[PDB]
Write a protein that binds this ligand. Structure first.
Ligand code: NI
Ligand code: NI
Ligand code: NI
Ligand code: NI
Ligand code: NI
Ligand code: NI
Lengths: 435, 435, 435, 435
């Protein structure tokens, strides 16, 4: 899809505004709105000058402005704006060299895919994530200097009309798994795409979910553990690799899974805590990664066991042979999370890392001399951030991740880890006020 | 009715979503909604992969996913959904063998009917149940750690428009017995069908009742005893057996009832407590099965007496000669309840079990040496569950009920029996607080 | 599809009338309209008494009334009637024995399919015909005692809205081949079905075409040669045979065509003039079966040559391997034409009749010693009728065609052949008035 | 633009039909309409099987069916069809090799552009044509065996709404030159594109013009000389060549025109009669190519003279430096005409053919020894066809034009040349009836 069709869309729909959208390192979606008459054919080869004071690494204290370069293939009319608006996802570029910014998640995902095609291991990667959310009727939260409080108060029309709006915005939905045990938790299934296209689709997914919940007087949250004792929100990711139109993950070994797939799983397992720094970036994210029942915390693979973090779905077709990693949560930044998973898999393929043996029939039942032995995902955000700081190397292959970008990301996550670490919590008043 | 007509219905009505519905062992109705463009001709020969974490036996800790195979003959447009939806009832199948799941109520009902046709006793069975419900204006209930509470606050338009919606959804209604003594209690009469078709119709019946009551700002409940001292909600079941188009229950013996019918009643009477485990599955269900006036608790048959649990209606036609069992309540799972009743009757026919003699003129008036002698239905849910655990055999004939399915059902009922058993109740505060 | 769903359709659509439709031996579609309140559940097991004075064999001078037994699976709402009408196709049955009438085309097609399944050669037969029609702006014709005259005066909306109405009436359309050379001639392609279902679909096809052309102020005709020198209207028929879900026409011989398929072609070739009596039943039909260019008159098969009457389409799938016979015209009676083709093929399979050799590169170019040798289709309606009278045998196998039915059909065709034979024609005034 | 966006367009606009359009060798636009539900993702990688009995070379008497492969980037909603239709231009491919048909104009244009990029002379070619048409109020014509006749009877709303509909269909209009001298003649100016895109735009241009004229009760014709003595309809073509984003036609020689441009003009001049066979394909086309005033018949170039066929527009920008050839008429087939012009220019560039000297100040004033010397365009269709038959070579470079394709084109043009040659014309009755 080119720019000429975008101008044709502008004239066709009588678009008044164009909303240029990009993503922080935090994963939040930033936008600049320009009038539709400011969009010309030349606008797609210079972009728009932008002031980079966005939170995170973009708050670099030496530098000048950045460039918003739109991707014309991502244009879609916004369903929620009263004045007809055309949404375009943009990359952040350095104004001089006109190259992708080092601290841009979308540019990093594009670099990861380019490095994939460069190494010759595969031609493309297919990602299907399963982001789950919570729908609440109401919620009030706050934390002043004299205390804290939170209070959450828990239809088919909302779910169906979410699916309708998602299909308006170019997503191909194919199910909707409302859950009656742990009521409130929903998940819409969508079709697989490549890495950066699927990350853009996740951003659209969250936008639609939030706004449709708003219009029905509800509140949706992609927060990994919004509520005590009830099951948390996860985002399982199915990965496949394709070269010239055939799976590299289809083979003859365990559960019909190929040798390259086994090294992919080995690479994911080895770096899973550095990955956890990016796939599980919040402190809330580790209140659902606690050892127990149905918790994706054991770093091993099994088609049968459902305590293993890496699952191998059984499909009656060799053309659909993928691996599902289950520890990521929907609070991740899709670009950074997906790039981290891809680079871990590529480092596993490159170094012939063997995962080991399938943990078919060994759940959290605490085997006498195996519960401690099996690798686990990070236990807290500090541990994941420290392991990322130590294990930068697999992210730097091919120049996808800069040391400066990783440093800025880690500092930005730490300034929230510390705010959580130093406030006193009401459960500690319940337990330790008298003590 | 085939799949081609279902695709034609999709195109005709401009259906946007398809709602695939199945039933727990608890009897609750579960659903998965898929977009209408995901429904193709091939969809009716592979089904839809489903994650079986539903409550009950389906929470089996070894196993992988199940298959939702729709029954195209059960397709009906949903009247209550804003976005046009097509409801299809589905069976749960094991993905490999592609056979009916052992813990699936609908598959069990189908197996029971198949065993009926296999034994050669009859060709088909006709079930007509009479589920009664309560309409309330409002209700608030709850039970915290510091107490409990319940409060229930008690037109023709609602009843008539229920009947209209039921006839929209393929049900053939033929009466509506609002009751002025014990106000609030309603019942819609519908036409007889075979076992599994009638169970599907009961599920539609409950769905329509609940949602129509919702839209008028009321609350309907199929709970056997929602309110003290007032008469409880029952579900009387008329059974008939037909072979090549003639009743096997029509004859020349008592009240024009045939010998095969008498053995059917004998088999129902013998196993009536194992049946009670399935037809009366709640602890509330035994607050209406208390000995007294108009309580269907005496295990005997009579055309005249109305304290006998098994009634023989008098009909001026040999083509309508049935037996009515009156102890079941609308909280039963229609598939399991109907399969249990059919298998008890078939075991009575197979073993030539004679019921005995009609209790024509012997009510609850406590005869000097007969009140204790006459068999009674179970007195509590624990007694019924224990008798089911001991009397599995009649359910296992022909492989309809698996030991594993019965075990899972009993455990699932016990986890609620125990929750009821260990909470203190406000009437015990009224009676025993000072004591 | 059963009768209960038909009654549900009556109540759902608020149907006022039910139109029971059947087909003459001439192929014309007869109907009886009854009020919708005359349609009850019992109506589908006694039919409707009918006075059989219809033209053709049904005008039997001894006999009493016949029975219209509806096929509930053929119910469809009529798009053209102002008062909502439900169309149901009916069979004609003998009132006493309640068996299919011997002179009923639909009953004959059902008998042919039953004989197919009986012989064990195959399980089902798939027919796809390609009926072509002419759309004219106006036409006036007539023939009095003092002369004769005819005058024919030749958009996308009509074609598209024909396809829309055909898909309303249960047909699956998949193309529309308007033709610019020989303007006026159209053809809608539809999906393959079994014999009698496809014949019912051809009747619906003609009904829709005629009425949609009426509403746009046009005139459509399925007449094999309505206009001089311009190409005539044909109805090519693709046949396939399936047993347990696999083609019997897929193999390894010429053009990937199986041995059973070769005997099918041999049987069609041997009896092609007796077939022509039924597939080409009009005298007009032999003004397009004249030897020349693109005329399907040579009784031979070839994947490449297009002067052969039997074509073998090349398809990049073994699951679609069929034979196309091209001599039939849309004036045929679909039931009788299809039954004749099926029985010729079955007699070829039964007697191991070998077709011979493919005529790949031999068109009408008149080879020195082959133009006379190759078998041809009948040259006139009298020749075809005489060959049918002599070659009854292949039609009588399994009792599908009665001698009495064939005799009545031949007499009914002859009374029109003779009317054409004895009137003087204006071209004979042009040629012979002075002579 | 890809296929996925086309399916999204199908769902978005609620498209009912898809109209697949291709072009004869005569230039006429053929179409096949399929229902929108027949269009799936796989439809864009197999196409649609088509019966190639179209007039011209496609009427090849040996061959089987062809394949319609749609170009998803050419999808546009049809403004004139009542039932929402999506137009897609298709290529004709050989079913086996799945390569472009040799007798397909669009495939030939694609081959010409591919050969352009292959030779390395330039990277792309920009064509801007100026097709002129006549708007008439009414017209009646005919030619029977007893005579002939023609009668033509000659607003801003029509022109403006033509421009509106053209911009609906993706064309970028930028003027509308209604002409008051020679009333009736119109021309819409549009923006330059590459060869095959501009040819598709010419087909859309003609479609819009014809249908908009229809709806206002007018008749538009792109016929080079519809009316006596009044100026004829032409189609001037501006050519430019670009390599890596810069004109090769911009330089320092005559009128700021580069050396490569001069060889391009030389090549066009040398082969201009073989070109005339394709750019001026009708016999009417040579009633406007008669020597005289403002007739583009002198084969020479000049920025000032307007009797030269090749003009060099003066533009105040080196980025817009093109050559305009003025002899082509709108009855040409855009693909074949443009491919012929491009190949003549490429043969001129390849062979260093020098055009000669500019004919700045030498009009048709008949110089004493120059009127005969200067090369002229063909004087009749027979002369142009003969010169094409003799001068095939420049068209065959790179395999763009097959000998078989050229032969079929020439035969197809001759069968119309001969029909014109052998009928007697009313002006010959005016001149020679008494003589
Ligand atoms: Ni998952
Ligand atoms: Ni229906
Ligand atoms: Ni009752
Ligand atoms: Ni054909
Ligand atoms: Ni678009
Ligand atoms: Ni010009």
């Amino acid at each position: 899809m080119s720019a000429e069709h975008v101008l044709t869309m502008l004239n066709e729909h009588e678009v008044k505004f164009v909303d240029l959208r990009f993503t922080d390192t935090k994963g939040k979606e930033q936008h600049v709105t320009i009038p539709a008459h400011q969009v010309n054919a030349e606008f797609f080869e210079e972009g728009k000058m932008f002031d980079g004071s966005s939170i995170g690494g973009w708050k670099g204290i030496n530098e000048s402005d950045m460039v918003l370069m739109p991707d014309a293939s991502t244009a879609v009319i916004d369903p929620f704006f009263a004045d007809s608006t055309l949404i375009i996802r943009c990359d952040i570029l350095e104004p001089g060299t006109l190259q992708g910014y080092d601290r841009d998640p979308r540019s990093i995902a594009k670099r990861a895919e380019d490095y994939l095609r460069s190494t010759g291991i595969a031609d493309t990667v297919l990602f299907g994530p399963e982001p789950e959310f919570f729908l609440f009727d109401d919620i009030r939260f706050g934390s002043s200097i004299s205390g804290s409080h939170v209070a959450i108060d828990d239809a088919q029309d909302i779910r169906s009309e979410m699916c309708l709006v998602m299909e308006q915005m170019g997503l191909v939905v194919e199910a909707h798994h409302h859950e009656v045990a742990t009521a409130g938790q929903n998940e819409v299934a969508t079709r697989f795409n490549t890495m950066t296209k699927k990350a853009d689709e996740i951003q659209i997914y969250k936008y639609v979910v939030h706004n449709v919940a708003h219009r029905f007087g509800k509140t949706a949250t992609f927060m990994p553990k919004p509520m005590f004792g009830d099951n948390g929100s996860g985002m399982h990711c199915h990965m496949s690799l394709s070269k010239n139109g055939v799976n590299l993950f289809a083979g003859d070994k365990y559960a019909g899974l190929s040798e390259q797939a086994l090294y992919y799983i080995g690479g994911v397992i080895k770096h899973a805590k550095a990955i956890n720094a990016l796939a599980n970036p919040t402190t809330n994210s580790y209140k659902r990664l606690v050892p127990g029942y149905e918790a994706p915390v054991m770093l091993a693979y099994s088609a049968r066991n459902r305590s293993a973090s890496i699952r191998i779905p059984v499909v009656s077709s060799p053309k659909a042979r993928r691996i599902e990693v289950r520890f990521p949560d929907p609070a991740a930044n899709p670009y950074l999370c997906f790039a981290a998973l891809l680079m871990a898999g590529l480092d596993g393929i490159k170094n012939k890392i063997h995962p080991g043996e399938a943990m078919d029939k060994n759940l959290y039942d605490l085997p006498p001399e195996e519960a401690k032995e099996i690798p686990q995902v990070a236990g807290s955000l500090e541990e994941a951030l420290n392991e990322l700081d130590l294990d930068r190397e697999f992210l730097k292959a091919g120049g996808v991740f800069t040391d400066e970008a990783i440093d800025a990301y880690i500092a930005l996550r730490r300034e929230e880890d510390d705010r959580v670490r130093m406030t006193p919590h009401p459960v500690e008043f319940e337990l330790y006020y008298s003590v």
